């Protein structure tokens, strides 16, 4: 499912402390915060990378 | 949202009696049936067109 893949991408992009020491993708939008471990993140139609 | 668009496509494809007199797209998969008015249809990652 494309959903799982989208989540994989978001995961690769996240830039809140405690995620990726070096994010290979740039979180151009609400790619989640440290407040919930990236779970806050917005829907794919929202964020860019 | 891409969801609404996917639904638009599915709608353009449906080929059960009572849908499209001439479906401009081909329903290559479970594009819904007459049993629920196309609501049965399967998820986008499923069907092709």
């Amino acid at each position: 499912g494309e959903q799982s893949l989208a989540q994989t991408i978001i995961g690769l992009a996240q830039n809140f402390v405690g995620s990726n020491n070096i994010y290979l993708l740039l979180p151009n939008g609400a790619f989640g915060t440290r407040a919930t471990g990236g779970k806050d993140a917005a829907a794919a139609r929202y964020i860019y990378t | 949202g891409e969801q609404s668009l996917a639904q638009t496509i599915i709608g353009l494809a449906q080929n059960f009696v009572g849908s499209n007199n001439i479906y401009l797209l081909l329903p290559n998969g479970a594009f819904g049936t007459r049993a629920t008015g196309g609501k049965d249809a399967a998820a986008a990652r499923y069907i092709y067109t």
Partner: protein
């Protein structure tokens, strides 16, 4: 779930069934025309290496047009496979 929740259920022979579907669908286009449905990798491969060159064709990775489904059910005894009732070292493996 069946073996764990229900004792002696999987002992009944011919209770659990399986509906299977061909893994790939080949279509012959230029030379002569028919369609070959393969149940597995080995068959499709032996054919792919020992017959494919003799035609122009297209392979379809395994939704299938309902009219083919009707066929799936017309002779479903070929697509139906039965599990053997628990025997030694069946439960153990489960």
């Amino acid at each position: 779930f069946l073996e764990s929740s229900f004792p002696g259920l999987l002992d009944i022979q011919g209770f659990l069934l399986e509906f299977i579907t061909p893994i790939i669908k080949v279509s012959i286009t230029k030379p002569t025309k028919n369609t070959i449905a393969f149940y597995n990798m080995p068959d499709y491969e032996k054919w792919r290496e020992e017959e494919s060159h003799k035609f122009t064709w297209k392979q379809k990775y395994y939704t299938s047009l309902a009219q083919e489904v009707r066929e799936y059910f017309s002779n479903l005894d070929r697509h139906l496979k039965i599990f053997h009732s628990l025997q030694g070292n069946d439960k153990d493996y489960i």
